[PDB]
Ligand binder design. Sequence first.
Ligand SMILES: CSc1ncc(Cl)c(Nc2ccc3c(c2)CC(=O)N3)n1
Ligand SMILES: CSc1ncc(Cl)c(Nc2ccc3c(c2)CC(=O)N3)n1
Ligand SMILES: [Cl-]
Ligand SMILES: [Cl-]
Ligand SMILES: [Cl-]
Ligand SMILES: [Cl-]
Lengths: 123, 123, 4, 4
Amino acid sequence: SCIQFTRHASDVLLNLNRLRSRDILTDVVIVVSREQFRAHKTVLMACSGLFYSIFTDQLKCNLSVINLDPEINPEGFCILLDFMYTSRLNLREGNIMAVMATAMYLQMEHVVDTCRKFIKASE
Amino acid sequence: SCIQFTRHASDVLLNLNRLRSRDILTDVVIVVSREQFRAHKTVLMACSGLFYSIFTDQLKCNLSVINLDPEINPEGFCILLDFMYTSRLNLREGNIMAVMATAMYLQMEHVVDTCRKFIKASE
Amino acid sequence: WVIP
Amino acid sequence: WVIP
Ligand SMILES: CSc1ncc(Cl)c(Nc2ccc3c(c2)CC(=O)N3)n1
Ligand SMILES: CSc1ncc(Cl)c(Nc2ccc3c(c2)CC(=O)N3)n1
Ligand SMILES: [Cl-]
Ligand SMILES: [Cl-]
Ligand SMILES: [Cl-]
Ligand SMILES: [Cl-]
């Protein structure tokens, strides 16, 4: 018999992004080919199968720095981190291959699906 | 020129609630008249003007335990904590006064608004 | 607010 | 996915 507030999840995510932009309560640095990205472990886990696995590991859950595979492109990661905190994906002809490869590595199934569809349309 | 994934914010919140239910990466205990509630500081801040003010304070941001005013009802808090993580509010004739009072104290404006409207309809 |  |  609950009532539901339609905009609540969006408003929560908007506030989480405001905290990220002001570097409030960020608890991890993600290192991508020397580029550094500060974030909240819980948001990373909520969006990515890879971060979910990393931060549920009894040893890795305590790390303040995570280094990604050197093949990962920092721009592709940046676009995906922005998507995690906003639901908006900056998908462009010039970045689609790097975004899809990063989303496959991060295990972000819905992003991989839209990249596959956008690539299929251009062939 | 971004594309947007409609269900992303809801899916993020659903995963944050799964982490809460499994007590994963919870970093604070909220004490309400001896009852204890584990949660994520970032989610509390994203939903409540009171928690936002508390955890942006340079001393309180580091506390692992927060004690609420003794007038706060633990059931009212529990219903509001559930709403924070789900967008669903269990509003009932028997709890509406305690829920509104707790939402006013926590500074959850949209919850206060619906409680005022539901109370006005019964008079 | 809605009935979910 | 939509055009926001
Ligand atoms: C599976 S239970 C669960 N519970 C809590 C969290 Cl934080 C979580 N995250 C997560 C796991 C896998 C995947 C994603 C998020 C996005 C994606 O495409 N795959 N999962
Ligand atoms: C105002 S900027 C901002 N930035 C980040 C966060 Cl985490 C935040 N939360 C917050 C503040 C006030 C209120 C709520 C959340 C719910 C409500 O009714 N009032 N606010
Ligand atoms: Cl470390
Ligand atoms: Cl995704
Ligand atoms: Cl403490
Ligand atoms: Cl609210």
